[PDB]
Ligand binder design. Sequence first.
Ligand SMILES: [O][C][C]1O[C](/O=C2/[C]=[C]C3=NC4=C([C]=C([O])[C]=[C]4)OC3=[C]2)[C]([O])[C]([O])[C]1[O]
Ligand SMILES: [O][C][C]1O[C](/O=C2/[C]=[C]C3=NC4=C([C]=C([O])[C]=[C]4)OC3=[C]2)[C]([O])[C]([O])[C]1[O]
Ligand SMILES: [O][C][C]1O[C](/O=C2/[C]=[C]C3=NC4=C([C]=C([O])[C]=[C]4)OC3=[C]2)[C]([O])[C]([O])[C]1[O]
Ligand SMILES: [O][C][C]1O[C](/O=C2/[C]=[C]C3=NC4=C([C]=C([O])[C]=[C]4)OC3=[C]2)[C]([O])[C]([O])[C]1[O]
Ligand SMILES: [Ca+2]
Ligand SMILES: [Ca+2]
Ligand SMILES: [Ca+2]
Ligand SMILES: [Ca+2]
Lengths: 121, 121, 121, 121
Amino acid sequence: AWKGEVLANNEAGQVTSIIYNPGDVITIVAAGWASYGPTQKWGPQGDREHPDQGLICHDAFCGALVMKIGNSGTIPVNTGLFRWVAPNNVQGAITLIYNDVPGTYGNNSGSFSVNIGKDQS
Amino acid sequence: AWKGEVLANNEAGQVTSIIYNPGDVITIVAAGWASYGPTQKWGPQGDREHPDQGLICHDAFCGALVMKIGNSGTIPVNTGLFRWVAPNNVQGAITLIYNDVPGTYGNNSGSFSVNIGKDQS
Amino acid sequence: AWKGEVLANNEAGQVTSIIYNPGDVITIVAAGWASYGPTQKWGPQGDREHPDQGLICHDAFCGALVMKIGNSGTIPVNTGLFRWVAPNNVQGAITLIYNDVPGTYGNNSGSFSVNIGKDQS
Amino acid sequence: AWKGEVLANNEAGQVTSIIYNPGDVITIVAAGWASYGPTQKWGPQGDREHPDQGLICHDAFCGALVMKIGNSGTIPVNTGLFRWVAPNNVQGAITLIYNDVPGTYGNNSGSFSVNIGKDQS
Ligand SMILES: [O][C][C]1O[C](/O=C2/[C]=[C]C3=NC4=C([C]=C([O])[C]=[C]4)OC3=[C]2)[C]([O])[C]([O])[C]1[O]
Ligand SMILES: [O][C][C]1O[C](/O=C2/[C]=[C]C3=NC4=C([C]=C([O])[C]=[C]4)OC3=[C]2)[C]([O])[C]([O])[C]1[O]
Ligand SMILES: [O][C][C]1O[C](/O=C2/[C]=[C]C3=NC4=C([C]=C([O])[C]=[C]4)OC3=[C]2)[C]([O])[C]([O])[C]1[O]
Ligand SMILES: [O][C][C]1O[C](/O=C2/[C]=[C]C3=NC4=C([C]=C([O])[C]=[C]4)OC3=[C]2)[C]([O])[C]([O])[C]1[O]
Ligand SMILES: [Ca+2]
Ligand SMILES: [Ca+2]
Ligand SMILES: [Ca+2]
Ligand SMILES: [Ca+2]
């Protein structure tokens, strides 16, 4: 299992020690407060009221927690995933990333605390 | 070995000549272009941007190629499977199917060309 | 057999460990999502709607997976090849390459995951 | 080896396929013309006349080519590195980056063409 922080201003994301392998079932729980700019902060689901101006993940809100597995495209994490299995042909280290528009991470703040573990399978 | 076409609008699926037997190793390669409704077409992985609105296979995108072995649950095929072995207790004729919402196949178009063969074991 | 990934941003492609020899029968299965610039992503068949502006392979769409065998010309791979035998004489290491216009790979993203194996002959 | 281009306007840089490991000896050659905003363009050593207004790399001119390896700090690349060995405890993926002030990449233009290879060691 892995536990750590993902900073909202980290554009390249936080690489974890979890290597997702084919067939793996995983659980993720994410908590905390962060912002893509405003002084207000939001949780791991992001800001449901904010428009998508070119987010790295178009299937989650701005300010949401997302991830990449190996060199996959972004996948929404939000508050977490429960006994979750990746699509076919997706594998590799899990990298956690705050959902924002490329080039605009500089004014972000806060972080999410995240647990990831592999489940019985 | 089997080679044939799977029409996107064929809700029942295309039954192939391949009977999958315990211990069998198979390879599938799929190609072509199809749509679940829009003018655009997609390849065998389907449309990654599209929400799951009640697809026959929740483990693949809308417009992806999937299959049933005998009466198994749906199994993602996508662009294909390389030297793949079925889950415990899965056996019978392989049926190829376009991934869409039941009752909505009528506006589908295009097809995938698919090869299936058995590998050494 | 060989399994690995090829970056859309790499003009040099990915050299594999497969040496294609006269008479060899091979199978390739490719999957994944990549872009040659636009926000959308496409599978290994590429973008069937995009014009050819000087692609390294004129026989496949922009954004498709292609290959070279030794010092051959580019050969389309797309989603894969099923028990495929090459054009006469062709031989040498297989290099996998993303199909784009030379000099323009700078805005490319994503990758394809590929399995290659030799079949019986 | 890796071959490609690095867009001047990409704040996140260009993540190559090269993973730098302890002991590796690498060569990089970079060419081309790019700008941090003005209509003029400069080569990979950037603009020797331009003041540092908060560059991501203080050891290179604005408009220069630099890199990170894994999560290292920025390392000047300029026109390239000849049979180069990294500092102790530096390792990981090579990301190439245009040297500009954070939050100001949006008006940049052009790119550098870059080759990276591992040398014998
Ligand atoms: O998207 C992303 C971005 O965001 C920003 O912030 C902000 C804030 C506020 C706002 N509002 C509005 C808009 C638009 C429209 O249309 C209306 C309204 O937007 C916005 C934004 C930040 O700052 C940045 O950085 C980014 O992240
Ligand atoms: O899913 C399945 C279905 O699909 C359809 O198509 C379509 C088109 C378009 C669209 N759009 C949108 C949606 C959702 C949301 O949320 C938004 C937007 O969806 C859709 C869909 C068809 O028609 C049918 O048939 C089926 O397939
Ligand atoms: O080809 C290749 C290339 O591509 C690009 O992208 C793009 C985008 C958009 C567009 N649009 C149009 C065209 C043409 C015509 O004629 C019209 C319209 O194109 C295009 C393109 C990129 O960016 C690059 O890089 C390359 O890849
Ligand atoms: O650095 C960086 C920046 O840059 C800019 O651009 C520019 C242009 C011009 C100029 N001039 C001058 C200066 C300073 C002093 O002191 C004097 C003069 O600066 C400048 C700048 C841009 O726009 C931005 O974006 C950035 O990149
Ligand atoms: Ca922001
Ligand atoms: Ca439909
Ligand atoms: Ca391109
Ligand atoms: Ca600038």
